[PDB]
Amino acid sequence: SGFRKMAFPSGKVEGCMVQVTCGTTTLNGLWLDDVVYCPRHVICTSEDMLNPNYEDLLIRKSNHNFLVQAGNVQLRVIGHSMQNCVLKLKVDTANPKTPKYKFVRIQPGQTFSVLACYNGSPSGVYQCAMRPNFTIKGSFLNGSCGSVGFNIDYDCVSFCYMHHMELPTGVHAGTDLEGNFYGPFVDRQTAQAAGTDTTITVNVLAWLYAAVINGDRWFLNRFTTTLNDFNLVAMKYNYEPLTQDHVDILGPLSAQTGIAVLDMCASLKELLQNGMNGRTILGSALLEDEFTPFDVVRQCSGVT
């Protein structure tokens, strides 16, 4: 019993972190096999960031200008290339701590763990969701760029995020490991609209099932609803519209608890319309949307 915002064990990712320095800029890189991946803005000076011509800035750099250090040891750079917003530095040594891995592009509403790093050294690990608007609400300071987001299925690390920047609003933006930004963001110091965010309905419902499993049941009611009626409420409260695909993904939790998905929707509808009335659910005084249905099943079953 108990339910926590749990991150994946970060060891397999810690073994991949390196420091990358180019000129005066230092950030983090991810060393997998014989390639080090890092944000391409490592080649910029603070002055270049207003509108960088990355192609031109990279033309002025050679392999020997990229200083890559894995803890105490220096890596020898034998190639460099830019792919979208990431640089790939080919090194002469395969990382001996390379775990089994994949590069994946996550969908908005999915969750992942972030290993925040500074100077190639891990500082902490936390779990977060990719917002529907493709931002993340992380905890990152200057020097954290190149820190990565990931999920782990048994012995395979699926890397889904590399941190690039903080928007003027304090929210975070980054790329997949092929350097493609999530969302409309560009790697420039410019005003960038993040766009309307919504609450991840399927995750709130999953977390309400997690609450029932762990004994917090006060919000259960005698009501039911339909997808159409619930979506009118979701619209008013800036929640993502619930679809049959979301209902299907909640099947295992509905089967375990015996609470039909639309009955849990009616509990959520009442909570949206009436608030918490000063009560809490799983130690929270708001409706939590950073746990997917898969996260709830994993945490409630003890998957390693």
Ligand X SMILES: CCCCOc1ccc(Cl)cc1CC(=O)Nc1cnccc1C
Active site positions, annotated:
41, 145
Q: Does 297 bind a copy of itself (CB under 8 A)?
A: no
Residue 300 binding partner per list ligand X, a copy of itself, none, with a CB distance cut-off of 5 to 8 Å that depends on partner kind: a copy of itself
Give the distance, in angstroms, between the CA of residue 221 and the centroid of all CA atoms in the same chain: 33
Q: Does 164 bind ligand X (CB under 6 A)?
A: yes
Residue with tokens 């009335």: 277
Q: Which stretch binds ligand X (CB under 6 A): 160-168, 230-238, 266-274, 289-297?
A: 160-168
What is the torsion angle, in degrees rounded to the nearest 10, for the CA atoms of residue 288, residue 292, residue 297 and residue 302? -80
What is the torsion angle, in degrees rounded to the nearest 10, for the CA atoms of residue 255, residue 257, residue 263 and residue 265? -90
* Minimum distance, C-beta of residue 27 to a copy of itself, in the bound complex (Å): 12
Buried b (16+ CB within 10 A) or exposed e, 155-194: eebbbbbbbbbbbeeebbbbbbbebebbbebebbbeebeb
* Minimum distance, C-beta of residue 213 to ligand X, in the bound complex (Å): 13
Residue 249 binding partner per list a copy of itself, ligand X, none, with a CB distance cut-off of 5 to 8 Å that depends on partner kind: none
Cβ proximity to ligand X, 23 vs 99, nearer residue? 23
Asked whether 24 and 153 are in contact (CB, 8 A), the reply is no
Q: Does 189 bind ligand X (CB under 6 A)?
A: yes
Query: Which member of 14, 48, 178, 270 binds a copy of itself (CB under 8 A)?
Result: 14
Q: Which long-range contacts (CB under 8 A, 24 or more apart) does 269-277 make?
A: 269/223, 269/225, 269/229, 269/230, 269/233, 270/219, 270/221, 270/223, 271/219, 272/233, 272/234, 272/236, 272/237, 272/239, 273/233
Residue 303 binding partner per list ligand X, a copy of itself, none, with a CB distance cut-off of 5 to 8 Å that depends on partner kind: a copy of itself
Q: Does 147 bind ligand X (CB under 6 A)?
A: no
Buried b (16+ CB within 10 A) or exposed e, 56-78: ebbeeeeeeebbbbbeeeebebe
Q: Does 10 bind ligand X (CB under 6 A)?
A: no
Size of the site for a copy of itself (CB under 8 A): 55
Task: Provide the residue type at 254 as one letter.
Answer: S
Under rule CB under 8 A, which residues in 192-231 are in contact with a copy of itself? 214-215
Q: Does 194 bind ligand X (CB under 6 A)?
A: no
DSSP state of 222: S
Q: Which stretch binds a copy of itself (CB under 8 A): 170-178, 228-236, 247-255, 265-273?
A: 170-178
The pattern of x and - marking residues 110 through 149 that bind a copy of itself according to CB under 8 A reads -----xxxxx-xxxxxx-x--------xxxxxxxx-----
Radius of gyration of the chain (CA): 21
Residues that bind a copy of itself (CB under 8 A): 1-12, 14-15, 115-119, 121-126, 128, 137-144, 166, 170-172, 214-215, 275-276, 278, 280, 283-286, 298-304
Binding site for ligand X (CB under 6 A): 41, 49, 140-142, 144-145, 164-166, 187-189
